[PDB]
C-alpha cells in the first residue's frame, strides 16, 4: 500500500527521484519553463548533472516526508503551507503539481512493481486541494 511505497521509493530514492522527475519533464515538456537549466539535454546528460541529482533528491526527500506525515493520503496543512510559501515555488499554480503527480502515477502503473497507484493519485489530488486552501492559485 501507500506506506510500503514510501519505503520502496526511499530504498532507492536517487534513482526513483531522477526517473520520476524525468517522466514528468518528458510528458509535460512545457514544464521546463520552470527549470531552464534542464533544457536541451538528454536524460543521460541530466543524470550526470550535479544540480539535477541534488534537486530531484531534495524534492523527493521532502515529498516522501509529506506522504509519510499524511493520514489516509491526506497531507498535513502545515506541509501544504510550506510548499506554497517556499520562495522557490512563487508563481506556481496547482496545475503544475497535478502534472507532477500525473507523471508519478503513470510511472508507477508502467512499473513492474506493485505500487499502490490509486493511493498516489488520491494523495496528489488531496495535496492539490490543500495547496489551494493554503493560497496557491
55 known ligand binder: yes
CB-nearer residue toward ligand HEM: 30 or 72? 30
Q: Which residues bind ligand HEM (CB under 6 A)?
A: 31, 34-35, 55, 58-59, 62-63, 83, 88-89, 92, 96-97, 100
88 labeled part of a ligand binding site: yes
Q: Which is nearer to ligand HEM, 84 or 112 (CB)?
A: 84
15-57-88 Cα angle (round to 5):
145
Cell of 92: 506556481
Least distance from ligand HEM to the Cβ atom of residue 100, Å: 4
3-state DSSP helix/strand/coil % of the chain, to nearest 5: 75, 0, 20
Q: How far is the CB of 59 from ligand HEM (least distance, A)?
A: 4
d(CA 84, CA 90): 7
Shortest Å distance, C-beta 102 to ligand HEM: 11
Compare residues 72 and 112 and give the one whose CB is closer to ligand HEM.
72
Nearer to ligand HEM, 3 or 51 (CB): 51
Kindly state the DSSP code that residue 74 receives in the 8-state scheme: B
Smallest distance from the beta carbon of 89 to ligand HEM, in angstroms?
6
Beta-bridged to residue 74, according to DSSP, are: 71
Distance CA 93, CA 97 (A): 7
Q: Quote the CA–CA distance of 93 and 87 in Å, as a whole number.
A: 14
- List residues forming the annotated binding site: 36-37, 51, 55, 58, 88-89, 97
Amino acid at each position: 500500500g501507500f506506506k510500503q511505497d514510501i519505503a520502496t521509493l526511499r530504498g532507492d530514492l536517487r534513482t526513483y527521484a531522477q526517473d520520476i522527475f524525468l517522466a514528468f519533464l518528458n510528458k509535460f515538456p512545457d514544464e521546463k519553463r520552470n527549470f531552464k537549466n534542464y533544457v536541451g539535454k538528454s536524460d543521460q546528460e541530466l543524470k550526470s548533472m550535479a544540480k539535477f541529482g541534488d534537486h530531484t533528491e531534495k524534492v523527493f526527500n521532502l515529498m516522501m516526508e509529506v506522504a509519510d506525515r499524511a493520514t489516509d493520503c491526506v497531507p498535513l496543512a502545515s506541509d501544504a503551507s510550506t510548499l506554497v510559501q517556499m520562495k522557490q515555488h512563487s508563481g506556481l499554480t496547482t496545475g503544475n503539481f497535478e502534472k507532477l503527480f500525473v507523471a508519478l502515477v503513470e510511472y508507477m502503473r508502467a512499473s513492474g512493481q506493485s505500487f499502490d497507484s490509486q493511493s498516489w493519485d488520491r494523495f496528489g489530488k488531496n495535496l492539490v486541494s490543500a495547496l489551494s486552501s493554503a493560497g496557491m492559485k
